[PDB]
Design a protein around this ligand. Structure first.
Ligand SMILES: COC1CCN(c2nccc(Nc3cc4c(ccn4C4CCCC4)cn3)n2)CC1
Length: 298
Protein backbone atom coordinates (compact mmCIF):
# COMPACT_ATOMS: atom_id res chain seq x y z
CA UNK A 1 0.00 0.00 0.00
CA UNK A 2 0.84 3.78 0.30
CA UNK A 3 4.27 5.04 1.53
CA UNK A 4 4.22 6.86 4.88
CA UNK A 5 6.04 10.12 4.19
CA UNK A 6 5.55 11.51 7.75
CA UNK A 7 8.59 13.39 9.20
CA UNK A 8 10.11 12.16 12.49
CA UNK A 9 11.48 15.33 14.10
CA UNK A 10 14.54 14.87 16.36
CA UNK A 11 14.70 17.65 19.01
CA UNK A 12 17.76 18.65 21.07
CA UNK A 13 17.52 18.32 24.93
CA UNK A 14 18.66 22.03 25.16
CA UNK A 15 15.58 23.21 23.10
CA UNK A 16 13.12 22.38 25.90
CA UNK A 17 12.66 22.53 29.69
CA UNK A 18 10.61 20.44 32.22
CA UNK A 19 8.43 22.62 34.49
CA UNK A 20 6.49 20.10 36.69
CA UNK A 21 5.22 16.48 36.74
CA UNK A 22 1.73 15.96 35.23
CA UNK A 23 1.48 12.21 36.02
CA UNK A 24 3.60 9.13 36.75
CA UNK A 25 2.88 5.42 36.24
CA UNK A 26 4.50 2.11 35.12
CA UNK A 27 5.51 3.60 31.69
CA UNK A 28 7.58 6.39 33.32
CA UNK A 29 6.59 10.03 33.84
CA UNK A 30 4.78 12.82 31.88
CA UNK A 31 6.07 16.39 32.44
CA UNK A 32 4.61 19.83 31.68
CA UNK A 33 7.25 21.77 29.71
CA UNK A 34 8.18 24.47 27.22
CA UNK A 35 9.72 23.97 23.78
CA UNK A 36 11.77 26.99 22.58
CA UNK A 37 12.91 26.00 19.00
CA UNK A 38 16.16 27.20 17.26
CA UNK A 39 16.12 31.01 16.81
CA UNK A 40 12.33 31.13 16.23
CA UNK A 41 11.21 33.46 19.12
CA UNK A 42 8.38 30.97 20.12
CA UNK A 43 7.49 29.09 23.35
CA UNK A 44 5.33 26.02 22.68
CA UNK A 45 3.64 24.49 25.81
CA UNK A 46 4.44 20.75 25.68
CA UNK A 47 3.91 17.40 27.45
CA UNK A 48 7.11 15.33 27.71
CA UNK A 49 6.66 11.54 28.05
CA UNK A 50 9.87 10.10 29.53
CA UNK A 51 10.57 6.32 29.86
CA UNK A 52 15.62 -1.61 28.77
CA UNK A 53 15.77 -2.29 24.94
CA UNK A 54 12.22 -3.83 24.96
CA UNK A 55 10.50 -0.72 26.47
CA UNK A 56 12.43 1.50 23.96
CA UNK A 57 10.88 -0.48 21.06
CA UNK A 58 7.35 0.01 22.50
CA UNK A 59 7.86 3.79 22.93
CA UNK A 60 9.38 3.96 19.40
CA UNK A 61 6.28 2.05 18.13
CA UNK A 62 4.02 4.69 19.78
CA UNK A 63 6.20 7.50 18.23
CA UNK A 64 5.81 5.90 14.75
CA UNK A 65 1.93 5.91 14.93
CA UNK A 66 1.75 9.33 16.75
CA UNK A 67 4.01 10.93 14.06
CA UNK A 68 1.78 9.48 11.28
CA UNK A 69 -1.48 11.27 12.34
CA UNK A 70 -2.62 14.80 11.53
CA UNK A 71 -6.18 15.76 12.48
CA UNK A 72 -7.77 18.45 14.74
CA UNK A 73 -9.34 15.69 16.91
CA UNK A 74 -6.21 13.44 17.24
CA UNK A 75 -2.93 14.06 19.20
CA UNK A 76 0.18 14.20 16.97
CA UNK A 77 3.87 13.65 17.90
CA UNK A 78 5.74 17.00 17.86
CA UNK A 79 9.09 15.16 18.02
CA UNK A 80 11.39 12.82 19.96
CA UNK A 81 14.47 13.58 22.00
CA UNK A 82 17.22 10.95 21.81
CA UNK A 83 18.73 11.03 25.29
CA UNK A 84 19.84 8.00 27.36
CA UNK A 85 16.09 7.77 28.34
CA UNK A 86 14.23 8.62 24.99
CA UNK A 87 11.34 11.07 25.39
CA UNK A 88 8.20 11.87 23.35
CA UNK A 89 7.39 15.57 22.92
CA UNK A 90 3.64 16.15 22.61
CA UNK A 91 1.10 19.01 22.74
CA UNK A 92 0.12 20.14 26.28
CA UNK A 93 -3.59 19.35 26.81
CA UNK A 94 -3.83 21.65 29.86
CA UNK A 95 -7.19 20.34 31.17
CA UNK A 96 -5.97 16.69 31.34
CA UNK A 97 -8.07 13.61 30.49
CA UNK A 98 -11.81 13.84 29.73
CA UNK A 99 -12.62 11.16 32.32
CA UNK A 100 -11.34 13.25 35.29
CA UNK A 101 -12.74 16.41 33.68
CA UNK A 102 -16.39 15.05 33.68
CA UNK A 103 -15.92 13.85 37.31
CA UNK A 104 -14.37 17.17 38.53
CA UNK A 105 -16.78 19.49 36.61
CA UNK A 106 -20.18 17.62 36.55
CA UNK A 107 -22.01 20.68 38.06
CA UNK A 108 -20.98 22.88 35.06
CA UNK A 109 -21.19 20.36 32.22
CA UNK A 110 -24.27 20.90 30.04
CA UNK A 111 -25.85 18.96 27.11
CA UNK A 112 -24.08 21.12 24.45
CA UNK A 113 -20.59 20.19 25.76
CA UNK A 114 -21.46 16.46 26.10
CA UNK A 115 -22.91 16.14 22.55
CA UNK A 116 -20.10 18.28 20.99
CA UNK A 117 -17.46 15.98 22.70
CA UNK A 118 -19.25 12.94 21.12
CA UNK A 119 -19.06 14.63 17.64
CA UNK A 120 -15.28 15.37 18.13
CA UNK A 121 -14.47 11.80 19.25
CA UNK A 122 -16.49 10.42 16.28
CA UNK A 123 -14.53 12.83 13.94
CA UNK A 124 -11.17 11.74 15.38
CA UNK A 125 -12.15 8.07 15.16
CA UNK A 126 -13.46 8.42 11.55
CA UNK A 127 -10.06 10.03 10.69
CA UNK A 128 -8.19 7.03 12.22
CA UNK A 129 -10.43 4.75 10.08
CA UNK A 130 -9.48 6.82 6.94
CA UNK A 131 -5.79 6.24 7.89
CA UNK A 132 -6.64 2.45 8.25
CA UNK A 133 -5.61 2.70 11.96
CA UNK A 134 -7.37 0.58 14.62
CA UNK A 135 -6.96 2.35 18.03
CA UNK A 136 -7.68 -0.76 20.23
CA UNK A 137 -7.75 1.41 23.44
CA UNK A 138 -10.48 4.08 23.05
CA UNK A 139 -11.81 5.11 26.52
CA UNK A 140 -12.57 8.47 28.27
CA UNK A 141 -9.06 8.26 29.93
CA UNK A 142 -7.53 8.43 26.38
CA UNK A 143 -9.44 11.53 25.29
CA UNK A 144 -7.56 14.72 26.31
CA UNK A 145 -8.87 18.24 26.86
CA UNK A 146 -7.05 21.11 24.99
CA UNK A 147 -9.87 23.50 26.12
CA UNK A 148 -13.38 22.50 27.49
CA UNK A 149 -14.60 23.17 23.86
CA UNK A 150 -11.89 21.04 22.16
CA UNK A 151 -10.97 17.38 22.83
CA UNK A 152 -8.56 14.98 21.08
CA UNK A 153 -8.00 11.20 21.02
CA UNK A 154 -4.59 9.98 22.18
CA UNK A 155 -2.67 6.91 23.54
CA UNK A 156 -1.47 5.04 20.43
CA UNK A 157 0.33 2.40 22.59
CA UNK A 158 -2.05 -0.40 21.31
CA UNK A 159 -2.85 1.15 17.83
CA UNK A 160 -2.26 -1.06 14.74
CA UNK A 161 -2.88 -1.06 10.92
CA UNK A 162 -6.00 -5.71 27.80
CA UNK A 163 -8.96 -3.30 28.60
CA UNK A 164 -11.85 -5.84 28.92
CA UNK A 165 -14.78 -3.51 29.95
CA UNK A 166 -14.26 -1.33 26.78
CA UNK A 167 -13.76 -4.23 24.33
CA UNK A 168 -16.05 -5.68 21.68
CA UNK A 169 -17.04 -9.33 22.36
CA UNK A 170 -15.09 -10.57 19.22
CA UNK A 171 -11.96 -8.92 20.76
CA UNK A 172 -12.41 -10.66 24.18
CA UNK A 173 -13.22 -14.10 22.69
CA UNK A 174 -11.09 -14.16 19.52
CA UNK A 175 -8.63 -11.20 19.73
CA UNK A 176 -10.36 -9.70 16.59
CA UNK A 177 -9.90 -5.92 16.22
CA UNK A 178 -11.59 -3.84 13.52
CA UNK A 179 -12.84 -0.23 13.14
CA UNK A 180 -16.20 -1.78 14.26
CA UNK A 181 -14.56 -3.05 17.51
CA UNK A 182 -13.43 0.62 18.06
CA UNK A 183 -17.16 1.59 17.64
CA UNK A 184 -17.99 -0.69 20.67
CA UNK A 185 -15.30 1.20 22.69
CA UNK A 186 -16.79 4.48 21.41
CA UNK A 187 -20.17 3.37 22.91
CA UNK A 188 -18.52 2.73 26.35
CA UNK A 189 -16.65 6.13 26.11
CA UNK A 190 -20.04 7.90 25.56
CA UNK A 191 -21.56 5.98 28.54
CA UNK A 192 -18.62 7.26 30.65
CA UNK A 193 -19.33 10.89 29.63
CA UNK A 194 -23.14 10.55 30.02
CA UNK A 195 -22.71 9.17 33.57
CA UNK A 196 -20.12 11.93 34.41
CA UNK A 197 -17.29 9.38 34.80
CA UNK A 198 -18.82 6.19 36.23
CA UNK A 199 -16.77 2.95 36.04
CA UNK A 200 -18.33 0.47 33.49
CA UNK A 201 -19.67 -2.69 35.20
CA UNK A 202 -18.42 -1.52 38.65
CA UNK A 203 -17.57 -4.41 41.01
CA UNK A 204 -17.92 -7.08 38.26
CA UNK A 205 -14.56 -8.92 37.62
CA UNK A 206 -13.14 -8.81 34.03
CA UNK A 207 -13.45 -12.65 33.67
CA UNK A 208 -17.27 -12.41 34.15
CA UNK A 209 -17.71 -9.71 31.38
CA UNK A 210 -17.60 -12.17 28.37
CA UNK A 211 -20.42 -14.34 29.89
CA UNK A 212 -22.48 -11.22 30.85
CA UNK A 213 -22.32 -9.80 27.25
CA UNK A 214 -23.10 -13.23 25.68
CA UNK A 215 -26.37 -13.42 27.73
CA UNK A 216 -27.34 -9.98 26.33
CA UNK A 217 -26.57 -7.72 29.34
CA UNK A 218 -25.36 -4.17 28.51
CA UNK A 219 -24.38 -0.96 30.38
CA UNK A 220 -27.56 0.74 31.78
CA UNK A 221 -29.35 3.85 30.45
CA UNK A 222 -27.69 6.93 32.14
CA UNK A 223 -30.36 9.11 33.88
CA UNK A 224 -29.64 12.18 31.68
CA UNK A 225 -30.05 10.10 28.45
CA UNK A 226 -33.18 10.16 26.38
CA UNK A 227 -33.97 6.88 24.54
CA UNK A 228 -32.52 8.61 21.36
CA UNK A 229 -28.97 8.78 22.88
CA UNK A 230 -29.16 5.37 24.63
CA UNK A 231 -30.36 3.67 21.39
CA UNK A 232 -27.08 4.94 19.76
CA UNK A 233 -24.95 3.49 22.64
CA UNK A 234 -26.91 0.20 22.38
CA UNK A 235 -26.31 -0.03 18.56
CA UNK A 236 -22.52 0.28 19.26
CA UNK A 237 -22.88 -2.92 21.39
CA UNK A 238 -24.57 -5.22 18.78
CA UNK A 239 -23.03 -8.77 18.56
CA UNK A 240 -22.83 -8.41 14.71
CA UNK A 241 -19.98 -5.87 14.14
CA UNK A 242 -21.40 -4.73 10.74
CA UNK A 243 -24.76 -3.94 12.40
CA UNK A 244 -23.02 -1.35 14.65
CA UNK A 245 -22.98 2.30 13.42
CA UNK A 246 -20.08 3.63 11.39
CA UNK A 247 -18.12 6.56 12.85
CA UNK A 248 -19.27 8.72 9.91
CA UNK A 249 -22.93 8.06 10.94
CA UNK A 250 -22.05 8.78 14.64
CA UNK A 251 -20.72 12.19 13.47
CA UNK A 252 -24.10 12.84 11.71
CA UNK A 253 -26.32 11.53 14.58
CA UNK A 254 -24.56 13.40 17.39
CA UNK A 255 -24.37 16.60 15.20
CA UNK A 256 -28.18 16.69 14.61
CA UNK A 257 -28.58 16.30 18.43
CA UNK A 258 -25.96 19.01 19.23
CA UNK A 259 -28.21 21.52 17.31
CA UNK A 260 -31.01 21.01 19.94
CA UNK A 261 -29.15 19.56 22.96
CA UNK A 262 -31.95 19.80 25.56
CA UNK A 263 -34.17 17.53 23.40
CA UNK A 264 -31.60 14.68 23.78
CA UNK A 265 -30.04 15.18 27.27
CA UNK A 266 -31.96 16.20 30.36
CA UNK A 267 -29.72 18.01 32.92
CA UNK A 268 -31.04 20.20 35.78
CA UNK A 269 -29.65 23.74 35.45
CA UNK A 270 -28.40 23.22 31.83
CA UNK A 271 -27.77 26.54 29.87
CA UNK A 272 -27.08 28.44 33.20
CA UNK A 273 -23.84 26.37 33.40
CA UNK A 274 -20.45 27.77 32.27
CA UNK A 275 -16.92 26.35 31.67
CA UNK A 276 -13.61 28.32 30.97
CA UNK A 277 -13.40 29.76 27.38
CA UNK A 278 -10.40 31.55 25.67
CA UNK A 279 -12.70 34.66 26.03
CA UNK A 280 -12.25 34.56 29.89
CA UNK A 281 -9.91 36.57 32.18
CA UNK A 282 -6.66 34.74 33.11
CA UNK A 283 -7.65 31.72 30.86
CA UNK A 284 -4.17 31.48 29.18
CA UNK A 285 6.65 32.74 33.91
CA UNK A 286 6.78 34.92 30.71
CA UNK A 287 3.56 34.63 28.62
CA UNK A 288 5.65 36.39 25.94
CA UNK A 289 5.87 34.60 22.54
CA UNK A 290 3.88 31.48 23.61
CA UNK A 291 2.03 29.84 20.64
CA UNK A 292 -0.03 26.67 20.84
CA UNK A 293 1.35 23.60 18.93
CA UNK A 294 -1.71 23.73 16.58
CA UNK A 295 -0.45 27.16 15.26
CA UNK A 296 3.25 26.21 15.11
CA UNK A 297 3.83 24.65 11.68
CA UNK A 298 7.04 24.02 9.64
C1 LIG B 1 0.54 6.82 28.68
O1 LIG B 1 1.39 7.87 28.17
C2 LIG B 1 0.82 9.00 27.50
C3 LIG B 1 0.16 8.69 26.14
C4 LIG B 1 0.02 10.03 25.41
N1 LIG B 1 -0.76 11.06 26.18
C5 LIG B 1 -0.72 12.32 25.58
N2 LIG B 1 -0.82 12.47 24.25
C6 LIG B 1 -0.80 13.66 23.67
C7 LIG B 1 -0.67 14.80 24.47
C8 LIG B 1 -0.57 14.63 25.86
N3 LIG B 1 -0.41 15.74 26.68
C9 LIG B 1 -0.90 15.91 27.98
C10 LIG B 1 -1.13 14.84 28.86
C11 LIG B 1 -1.62 15.09 30.15
C12 LIG B 1 -1.82 16.45 30.53
C13 LIG B 1 -2.31 16.43 31.91
C14 LIG B 1 -2.40 15.14 32.26
N4 LIG B 1 -1.99 14.32 31.23
C15 LIG B 1 -1.93 12.84 31.27
C16 LIG B 1 -0.46 12.36 31.34
C17 LIG B 1 -0.11 12.50 32.84
C18 LIG B 1 -1.39 12.01 33.55
C19 LIG B 1 -2.55 12.23 32.54
C20 LIG B 1 -1.52 17.46 29.61
N5 LIG B 1 -1.10 17.16 28.39
N6 LIG B 1 -0.59 13.40 26.36
C21 LIG B 1 -0.52 11.15 27.65
C22 LIG B 1 -0.10 9.86 28.38
Amino acid sequence: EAPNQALLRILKETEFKKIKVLGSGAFGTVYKGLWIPEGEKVKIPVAIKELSPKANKEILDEAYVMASVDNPHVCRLLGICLTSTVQLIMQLMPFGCLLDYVREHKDNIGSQYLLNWCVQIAKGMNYLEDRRLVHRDLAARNVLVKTPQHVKITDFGRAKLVPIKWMALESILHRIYTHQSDVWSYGVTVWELMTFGSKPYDGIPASEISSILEKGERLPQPPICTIDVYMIMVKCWMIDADSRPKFRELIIEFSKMARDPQRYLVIQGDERMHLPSPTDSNFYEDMDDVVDADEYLI
